[PDB]
């Protein structure tokens, strides 16, 4: 129950249960090609009434950093704001855009602030942080514990194990940003309980030009198994 | 909770934080006359992990020191920033590098205050420190989650520490320990303790501390520089099997 | 620009005896060259044995006496007795040093009875340095009254004289004689002379007129 | 359990402490208030537990401003406190905006202070409901009631306490929108005498207050010559 | 049964049992009586000693030259509230140079004691007071309760075995108004005597009296100053 | 009223204060003896581990030139108490130029420990301290402090695992005869530490202070000499004369 | 246990936050909101049990700004607090930034406020839902809803209250045909939904209707003499 | 109801405050006696080893040259309250330039017990001194309750010692005789041979300050027993 308490085995139980809230959110894919990084996720609604052009699971932090998550969107909107502030603090001091690793460190610090006090629960989200700094792509994975991992490809959320084996068997380097989007959508198609439309998913890419959330037209283009 | 004694004068949260380290990766240190080294195992083993960083478990604290950690990693990232702040405060205050024992006392005074002051959890992290100073030379220390540091000549923290300790007791040759000897011993202790056999070079991390022309040096051996260390081990224990 | 002080005139006097104590004052209140009122006595009864005089800035004279009256009640609550003259004096010494950097512009004289019935006169500075005396003057005419008291009470610069102790009837005539003369050369000394006599039987009051010029 | 804190929900979205705080108002003596055409009239069933208490003790009608009155039912210390808050609200309103506070606004400001106690573990909810009443030439007559939950609604007639049902069943008979205050006094006293039960509890005192044209927007205790002239009508209408 | 360990908890019947339990701490102190004529207000107490060879506990306290209290309950709460009253009266003399009315003091006392009934981490004041005073409206007798409630009274007795004194006072209220001081004090003493066993009686050691009026500050008569007021009591049989 | 809070019991006890003393009944034995111009304390060693530098296992710790200290119990609480006493030893020369006395700093340490028995959210210091030192007038002093904030003065005392057995030894042995010279004041501590020791001599660490000298920790070249002298004086008396 | 304080459960769920969605249905009323091509409408029922209440004070529609209007559903005292906070935020937005707050932003500000109550154990969540409406510069009319948990989204139509599933079935059945949306069609759709799920044959006194249009962006609460005009047209066809 | 000082019993009781009283009987016994010639204080020390210097056991202490205290209960509470009394007696001198009375020292020291620090003080104190009103003896309790006493016994054997004082006490005594009576009572509630290190003794006369007896003065009264 309590968070400032170890078990005799030496485990933190509320953190393990906060990860269970990440393991039940919508899937999210991440692939790091040679000249870019892809972020894709399932954005599916419970009715035809929900306007999908109003909320976004893929969000920018800067011109060259972007996010997705698996789990709780209320928790996501806090870390989006915090990351956007920390990037601006870094810019205000150094007048250089923040590297993708320092943001992950400073954001895992925020996630760790919520693991040590009583009267606060941890975040029920994991993040995937894409970037393009120093002529190289980056992809990280921040957890509620305050721990981050650099990946070449991974998947979070529902069926995050088979979706990762699929990448282990269907991913290599010597790719580019267009061969990776096809692989990410194919990795999302495993868990898609229905017809995949341009409005049921959400895609964002980063490259030399910076981060951009693709449009439904571009999604419908590659949804035809095209490129 | 940590602010409560047992009738037998015990503190069980402090023991559970210490039990929370066997789940962590193995890290050992070996002192020598030419220098001092660390050797961690990378349990971050996966076909899709990138390994962008210089080092994942060896953290540099100063121009004359590094450390390795085992336990909760968020706590480690906290303590590694606090260490770097203590060092620079000493430098700002005296304009001389901090000795390799004042830093350990300063961090252990932080770790002790979490076993004593209300609603906060003890840091589930043990640490090893290697460094040089102009008072006692090359040193090796070992912290515990209770705020208890100790000087060592060779120790091990994390998974299967009690076995590596017994090996070091039976193969350390105090007074005649060079750095090649220490690495040759490390590749042995780290192979007779790892569950995954054959000791891939992808699954370890080694750092040496030495001196050159009155300057301190902290290097990290590359892949090809550790392949040689591995190849000169099966040859050594294949010759200890020839005499049948 | 705003200066927080102003001198409202005032003159006070006290004499001690073996069985009594007098504390006297004028009743004029002034403001520059003008006169505020001609009925404003500077003497205040604290206990059955103790009287205080206050002269200087009138706002501080009003504040400090209320503070003293509020401290007496607290003493009586905590200790179940009334205060002595020396205890009130030593307390006022701290109340005044509480404002060492923004002082009470007040010239104070306490007059009462010791713990064996003898007279007692304590004279203060605005910052709390106090001094037991036999007679002291304070206020605007203090420079004018003390020589004649030094002569006719201390018997100073007078040889082959009868060093007789001062009785009450002599002290009262002397007290009236000094204000009758200070009203002739000092412009702040004014209309009436209040005299509060302290004795074992209680505290009296007497009003005597002076010239209104 | 699920009924020990106001920071706690039940599996059906209920907060039982706030309801238990209303159970305390249900167990208190009855007060009523009726909005007339040109004012408001309060009446309280004031119980005298002992003959040693003076006539005037435990006043349950409060003046919160020179144009606003207040009648309470429940815990009385809580009511005195809430009166003290309703007074500083109206005080600060005049201090900041320079005119008498309206009652729709005062009701909201007190309702929120009451609602704030339904959210925390360190405090309980208030144990008193109460009516406010005012009259102004512009705003007219007004009557609001505020519950422990923090709800606030306007009224033409209202009751709080034990005999709430019995009293509103008599107030709906009144055509209050036609009448004046001196005629509704008789009705207020008649209802309080109808709902009072002499066997369930001992003798009682009748306590009345007014606000309207006949007081010029000044909340007043009713004079004695009129309170007696209404208590008499109450006795003579008990022949029924 | 299990809505009792905290004051911020209601019961399903709409009650707070910690307050009801604090009210039971007044029944543990010795008995006090209060009564008033149209000119004077009187408090008589019965003091109690811990060891026989010690002094009797003091029951009546001076608050100002026109207000005084008699206490039944916990000593510490009484010592805190008395020091509250004293400063609230000094604060009124400092600003206005007038004595604080008694209604405006007991209202403040109620406002003060209401907080522990509602916020957790503080105990309800387990002390009851009878407050006798005199102001521009005549004499007053006020009861104060651990429930943060207060009453204006013609007379009242509180403490152990106080129902006897209350029953006495309830049938002599019609006389207290035109009574002089001696008769009023004697009614108080007889109501107090009705709280004792038949074995015991009133004595100089165990009786304190407090009186305030128009031409009389609040004085206290404790041991030998009481014997004028005892002379006159009929030696009751049983 | 039971464990887990510093409240009270029906008997009038505070069990969280006793359970901290139970931690002082778990460390290594530490003795102290007061003489005339020498004062000696000794502490059992902590079972060295074949690969450890014993420079950092300091059980005996000086606070100033005239005062010294030895502790038993939790090892980390000792360091904080000792640093906070070392600071006061200098703040006392700042506030008044005179040096500190043994009772002053013992009282300060005891107040610091008392301060941690007052609140929840604070855990008592699980140590005791033998605080030996000197004064102006050269009066030797010895005090003993417990977690509860209590301090007394002693002619000789012990703390740790075996104090209940060394107290009987010093009861039977401590007189004015065994403090004739320094070498007899040290032999008493050696014999007392022998009653719980490994029958060795390498498991012993003794320090001494004189009116002239500063603190002086001994080397095994003298500990061995004293232990051999004591073994010889016991082979001759207990065996060869009875 | 895992249901009293806001901790996580083994399956990663927060039950005290789910139990605050159940308080929305304690008031016993249902709200409906519908969006058009030039309009946006909110609708709710106005149930007075007593004739002694003044019907003017019994409302669940509120004016946040001149251009934004709300309907609140759930516990009545929580709604006034959330509405006053919405008004404070809308006012400070314009004080700081110099233009009127959108609905897209006010909604997420309220949601950000509500999420802190789930992440900090100081205060309870509010047992209230909130539907806003407003006309945007480029986006057009907007319908936004927010939850006790801090979830928010835009809608073409939605409901809040007891009859919310059987209202969102009606609405999703009518929305697919994609007729020429208008003011009159919008209000008729809302009233028909609330009539079908309740089966009550409404009066003008039993409902209150707030509207906002591109012609007049000012939120206005309708009169009984203007609801009757739309009610009569329903019985015809 | 038993644990916590903010919780009333159904009968209106504070059991933690009573358990603070019960912590006094775990302390050794002390006796104080009034006399018109002065006040006496007499205590047991309870030495646990011959190695401890018994002068380091402060069970009677000087508060000022005219007031002396004797305590029983917890050591820490006693240190706190004794420092309070010493500081107050000198603040009084600084302000008013006179000697605080024993009643007022007791009143000011009892006001800390009126503070829930989160725990009642587990210590009772006897205050013996000389004032304008002559020799006075007072007794402070963990409840902050204080009262003047002519003779009082606190601690372990307070019941029997009090049941003896009520017989050997009269309001005409001398100080040499009361000192004899106190030690005779102390003899009977000890399973250890009364001697000049197992007890302390102090007096406060009008024309003499606080004075703790010595081994010589103690043995010269132990002899006549």
Numbering used by the authors:
A (entry chain B): 7 to 233
B (entry chain C): 8 to 251
C (entry chain M): 1 to 213
D (entry chain G): 6 to 245
E (entry chain F): 4 to 241
F (entry chain D): 3 to 244
G (entry chain A): 9 to 245
H (entry chain E): 8 to 123, 133 to 241
What does the paper say about this structure?
The 20S proteasome (20S) facilitates turnover of most eukaryotic proteins. The enzymatic activity of this system is carried out by the 20S proteasome (20S), a cylindrical, complex composed of four stacked rings enclosing an axial channel. To be degraded, potential substrates must first diffuse through a pore at the center of the distal α-rings before encountering the peptidase sites within the inner β-rings. In turn, this barrier creates a key regulatory role for the proteasome activators (PAs), large particles that bind the 20S, open the gates, and facilitate substrate selection and entry.
Next, we genetically installed NLSYYT in place of the last six native residues of PA26 (PA26E102A-Opt5) to generate a PA that now bound the h20S (Kd = 360 ± 160 pM) and potently stimulated its activity (EC50 = 42.1 ± 1.2 nM) via its C-terminus. To probe how the binding of Opt5 activates h20S, we then determined the structure of the h20S-PA26E102A-Opt5 complex by cryo-EM to an overall resolution of 2.9 Å. The cryo-EM structure resolves a single particle of the PA26E102A-Opt5 heptamer bound to an α-ring of the h20S. At this site, the N-terminal extensions of the α-subunits were displaced from the central pore and the diameter of the pore was widened by 3.8 Å relative to the apo α-ring, reminiscent of other open gate structures. First, we confirmed that the disabled activation loop of PA26E102A-Opt5 does not interact with αPro17, suggesting that this structure allows the determination of termini-specific mechanisms, as intended. At the occupied α-pockets, most of the P2 and P3 Tyr side chains of Opt5 made H-bond contacts with residues located in the reverse turn between αPro17 and helix 0. Six of the seven α-pockets contained well-defined density corresponding to the termini of PA26E102A-Opt5. As previously predicted, the α7/α1-pocket (interfacing the α7 and α1 subunits) did not contain density for Opt5, likely because this pocket does not have a canonical Lys residue (α1 His68). Hence, we categorized the C-termini in the α2/α3, α3/α4, α4/α5, α5/α6 and α6/α7 pockets as binding in an anchored (A) state and the C-termini in the α1/α2-pocket as binding in the unanchored (U) state. The dihedral angles of the P2-P3 residues of the bound Opt5 form a β-strand structure for the A state but a right-handed α-helix for the U state.
